[PDB]
């Protein structure tokens, strides 16, 4: 009996390999399409944004600078201490 049940396993396991193989191929194709489309989106957005910066350079910047620093200091605990400090062996 053992020989024929092993034969059943031999004849049954192999097709599911083809199944999973086709699935992994198709997922790779999906990745390709998504990546290229996202690339197009980003290039288009930068292309639109650049000329208005080449209009007024100085105040386009500080606004962006402050707007990013607000969030970067938003979510970090901070300890404001004066300098000339010596050592910190926690």
Cβ closest to another protein, residue 19 vs residue 41 = 41
Residues of this chain that interact with another protein (CB under 8 A) are: 36, 39-40, 42-43, 46-47, 49-50, 52-56, 58-66, 68-83, 90
Element (H, E) at 8: helix 2-53
Task: Give the nearest distance from C-beta 83 to another protein in angstroms.
Answer: 4
Cα 75 to the center of its chain, rounded Å: 20
Cβ closest to another protein, residue 12 vs residue 42 = 42
Distances (CA, A) of 90 to 30, 76, 77, 87: 50, 19, 17, 9
């Amino acid at each position: 009996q053992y020989i024929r049940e092993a034969e059943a396993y031999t004849n049954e396991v192999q097709p599911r390999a083809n199944g999973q193989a086709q699935r992994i191929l198709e997922e790779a194709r999906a990745y390709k399409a998504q990546t290229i489309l996202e690339a197009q989106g980003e290039v288009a957005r930068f292309a639109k944004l650049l000329p208005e910066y080449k209009a007024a350079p100085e105040i386009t910047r500080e606004r962006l600078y402050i707007e990013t620093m607000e969030k970067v200091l938003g979510n970090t605990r901070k300890v404001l201490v004066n300098d000339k400090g010596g050592n910190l062996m926690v």
